[PDB]
Amino acid sequence: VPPHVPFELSGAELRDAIVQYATNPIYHDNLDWLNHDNPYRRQLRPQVLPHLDYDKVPGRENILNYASLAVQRLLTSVYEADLVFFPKSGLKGKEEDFRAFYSPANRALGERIRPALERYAFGFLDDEVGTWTAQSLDAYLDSLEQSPVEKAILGSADRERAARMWLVQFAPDFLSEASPMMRNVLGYYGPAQSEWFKVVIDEYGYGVHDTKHSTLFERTLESVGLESDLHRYWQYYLNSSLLLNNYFHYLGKNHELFFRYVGALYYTESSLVDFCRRADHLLREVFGDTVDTTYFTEHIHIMAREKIIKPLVEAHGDGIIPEIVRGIEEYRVLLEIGDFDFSEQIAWMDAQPELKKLHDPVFEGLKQGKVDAPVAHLVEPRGELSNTHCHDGDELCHIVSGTMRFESGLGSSLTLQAGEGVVIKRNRLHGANIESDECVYEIHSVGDYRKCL
Amino acid sequence: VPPHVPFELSGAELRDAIVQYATNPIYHDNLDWLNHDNPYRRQLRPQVLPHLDYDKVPGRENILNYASLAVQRLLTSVYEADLVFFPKSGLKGKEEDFRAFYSPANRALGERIRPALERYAFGFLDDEVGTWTAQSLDAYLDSLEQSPVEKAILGSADRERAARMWLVQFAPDFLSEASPMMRNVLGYYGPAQSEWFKVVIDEYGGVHDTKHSTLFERTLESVGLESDLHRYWQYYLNSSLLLNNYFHYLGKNHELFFRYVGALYYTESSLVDFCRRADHLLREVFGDTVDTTYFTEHIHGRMAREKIIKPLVEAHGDGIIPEIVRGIEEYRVLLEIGDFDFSEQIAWMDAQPELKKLHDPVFEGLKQGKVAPVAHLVEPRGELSNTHCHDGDELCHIVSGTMRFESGLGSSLTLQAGEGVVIKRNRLHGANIESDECVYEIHSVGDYRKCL
Ligand SMILES: [Fe+2]
Ligand SMILES: [Fe+2]
Ligand SMILES: [Fe+2]
Ligand SMILES: [Fe+2]
């Protein structure tokens, strides 16, 4: 028997393999802000991946840096190759993009880099979350006010724009609802398999398309002027949103974390009533009667501890309890990241007029060397659309000549003319496009922008 | 934007990558003929994989050669990594085999070689199966004696052994029923998704006792067979794995989604005749004790042409009709291979006493130089050669010792000094040593009839 060479992929061979998967033309930069009914095109900005270090796994203080957002976009596209998508208007015309996403090359390229991507995205959870008995697990299970999402949407200068930015975050999740959960009911195991499929049955709405939860979220999006084609608002997905959705494909694809999904299954269903009640009350508060919230209220109309957790512990032993606990705590940490990330973006979107005015005083500090900041000069023609991204330090955009559309979120835009600019806060999703025949502008890497005031 | 380097894996780098995935100790040779309640260990015989050419894809005339059987075993192991398995007696004790099967290394190594394995396994179908209209398709759909399976089991010298060999072939399929089809209901598309999930619902029952996999459990336990995967892995036929791997092939690769739409029509619309013949066959062989509720419950075909095929062609155009037909015809070719492979295996098992007698005359023909390469072997007690096959007939001649020659589930021969057996090509077979030592020769006679 020949010796086994352990699987290894790191260093430059990892960067080349990640670039290889992402250089597929369906992943290149979009010329518009939205995807036009094409579920096979996902913008991964491949021109930046060669310059990132995937060997250096970041901590929680740095999971909002661009490399983590770049990895989230790669992981979403890698996971979703197992899911069936077709445009709302049909496959006719998009056959070539359909073949470039579902091909023997695309999945193998993404599956070979998945272990390394799955460690840059979730490696920090080891520092954020012993032996257990069924008795200790019970008490921990028994020990489980305005939400941060309510404060940001209700306290926003534009409540409707804030809520619409919140709804599109659930597009990859709710429109393919229970797709990650179904990864566990494949195979052959005990009665817990039928019990888990019982959740999927309700999650798919008995087979009827009208009561399917994915169709319910369509009417929710269509009631506020938003579309339901994936992935229309891909460029408006926050880092934390992809992190939350990718976590269940992470738990669902890798069956060694099957008991971690069992823990997160309890926590979601036991917190789902309060979440759906808050979403229904908040949406009707922002939009009124015109909003369709049947998706959330149906969940209140609708078994895991006795019918799944208990028989699994009796059959597979007490050694699986820490993983059930770890799945609960890992998910709670991720929810905290979403509340912080989403609240920072809304405040960043609402403060756009003042951060544009703030460009002046920051610009004077640099001219007086209050800080020493690297500068880059750029000349781009109209239609050079920088896809949405973020930076690890604050930047000062200064427009010398021309006209630029600075994007900070769905419905949040600034027109920047000659002599004007904007202060770009770090870790915030943002992009830009040129609206004039030519635009000359500068980018100042000031680190902390408050050091220039 | 850096230029795109197209995915490439062939030649020596392909063999190294296949050996790399299969050298996981959970894939090593089993010391017994059966797996004892461990769904994470599958025998892939990795010490033979370096000596196969995966670049030369064989045609249908050679898809029963051993190289195809080796690829079938790997593809099943790669496909089933997406499936949840737990032992019947619990995990407690299989933790490291459980971690050795469900790990990022096992999945990435198997997914990297999957495109090449799928070209070796299904490449012949390109030579075995234009534009279409909805009307041309309807007419093709409207135009679709004992079965070969009945003739083989009822014509067998041991009908009970014949039927038990037939039941274990469906273990990876029936015990994980609707698992390949459920790969298509993940995602986000039109009403056709809800129609497909309704078919999956019937296969799962939602209740565990009425779940169709549980019905097949009581079927196997009623004839003395166990329901833990993969106990009879060494007794799985090439064509059996080929049929099961075909639906994971269609389910994993969503570019073949409409090929599955064709295969969905044919199976459910032919499953009634299949289940009725199986119910009649099992009751004739076993009698009152056999539980055939699995087959009678199945007795989807009409919901699939109107509620799935019709709106899909209306939504995606006529260009998907050729793939729907291809899924139908590709499935019919594989059933033809299963019927031939299974009929040949039973005839090979029933003819064991005569093939032992036939060793004598084949052996003198070699003694007259009428035909053969020879290999001498000295193996100790407990040397269990896992089941495999060869591309030509071989003559096993025993000089000294005792050997248990395995030819199938319940088919065995004791081979002593001076005796032997004629090993027919492409037939699943194995061997074990029953004496403190066994010295024997293996003669590669090609066609054994040239020695008579
Ligand atoms: Fe739901
Ligand atoms: Fe930027
Ligand atoms: Fe069924
Ligand atoms: Fe042999």
From Swiss-Prot, chain B:
The record's region (HO-like) falls at 165-310
Q: Say yes or no: keyword Metal-binding present.
A: yes
Q: What is this protein called?
A: Nitrosourea synthase
**Gene3D superfamilies with a match to the protein in the record:** Heme oxygenase-like (1.20.910.10), Jelly Rolls (2.60.120.10)
For Fe(2+) 2, which residues are the binding ones?
A: E203, E268, H300
Q: What quaternary structure, including any partners, is listed in this protein's UniProt entry?
A: Homodimer.
Pathway the protein acts in: Antibiotic biosynthesis
Residues annotated as region Cupin? 378-440
Quote the entry's note on domains. Answer: Contains three distinc domains: N-terminal helical motifs involved in dimerization, followed by a heme-oxygenase-like (HO-like) central domain and a C-terminal monoiron cupin domain. The central domain catalyzes the two sequential N-hydroxylations of L-NMA and the cupin domain enables oxidative rearrangement and N-N bond formation to yield the N-nitrosourea product. The central HO-like domain can bind Fe(2+) and use it to capture O(2), forming a peroxo-Fe2(III/III) intermediate, which is an intermediate in both hydroxylation steps.
Instruction: Tell me the classification of the organism that encodes this protein.
Output: Bacteria, Bacillati, Actinomycetota, Actinomycetes, Kitasatosporales
For the null mutant, the annotation states: Deletion of the gene abolishes SZN production. Mutant accumulates L-NMA.
The pH profile of the activity is:
Stable and active at pH 3-8, but loses its activity above pH 9. Shows reduced activity in phosphate buffer at pH 4-6.
Instruction: Name the reported effect of H298A.
Output: Loss of activity
